[PDB]
Design a protein around this ligand. Structure first.
Ligand SMILES: [Zn+2]
Ligand SMILES: [Zn+2]
Lengths: 149, 55
């Protein structure tokens, strides 16, 4: 039907033959515009062994507009809301039709490995992240242990 | 063989965007791009398109 739908389906096929490293995604039921993603916690992070779930909402004009991505699993991170809302450039103003869910997930993993405190979504976690790195790592591990695994 | 159009992932890249110089799109998707047309890879304005006599 639409170009967005064909895009989402070819993208789904590319994901079923070349899945991103440490990541997977797919349709929640029969709707193609509603996906669920899974990111297993990166090893270069206090998020290890944890399995994190995300929701993905594709816009009606999708490849020309960014996907709404949010965490389902609770997580202790400077750029991630308590609503699971993500502060990521490529999901807002650095978006482009070239970017794909594969690239978005990979980018989110990179965001878990190396947060951006300069543009915090949780001010306090960012402040702790650039004053008490031990406290940050510690709490991150704990929250990784009570919600992820 | 080659990489597919970065936009629809179903066709061969068939043209070049100026002035950034990226080969990333098919003709149709290029027409599909919303005006003001920006490169899907670097988002710079597409001021000229030169077809690839490929595909
Ligand atoms: Zn195309
Ligand atoms: Zn370009």
């Amino acid at each position: 039907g639409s170009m967005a739908l064909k895009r989402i389906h070819k993208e789904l096929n590319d994901l079923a033959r070349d899945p991103p490293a440490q990541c997977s995604a797919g349709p929640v039921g029969d709707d193609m515009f509603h996906w669920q993603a899974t990111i297993m916690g990166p090893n270069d992070s206090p998020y290890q062994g944890g399995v994190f779930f995300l929701t993905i909402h594709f816009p009606t004009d999708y490849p020309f507009k960014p996907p709404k991505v949010a965490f389902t699993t609770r997580i202790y991170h400077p750029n991630i809301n308590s609503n699971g809302s993500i502060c990521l450039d490529i999901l807002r103003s650095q978006w482009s039709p070239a970017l794909t869910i594969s690239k978005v997930l990979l980018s989110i993993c990179s965001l878990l490995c190396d947060p951006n405190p300069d543009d915090p979504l949780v001010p306090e976690i960012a402040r702790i992240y650039k004053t008490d790195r031990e406290k940050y790592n510690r709490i991150a591990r704990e929250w990784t242990q009570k919600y992820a695994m | 063989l080659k990489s597919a159009c970065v936009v629809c992932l179903s066709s061969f890249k068939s043209c070049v965007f100026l002035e950034c110089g990226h080969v990333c799109s098919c003709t149709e998707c290029y027409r599909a791009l919303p005006e003001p047309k920006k490169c899907p890879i670097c988002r710079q304005a597409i001021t000229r398109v030169i077809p690839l006599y490929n595909s």
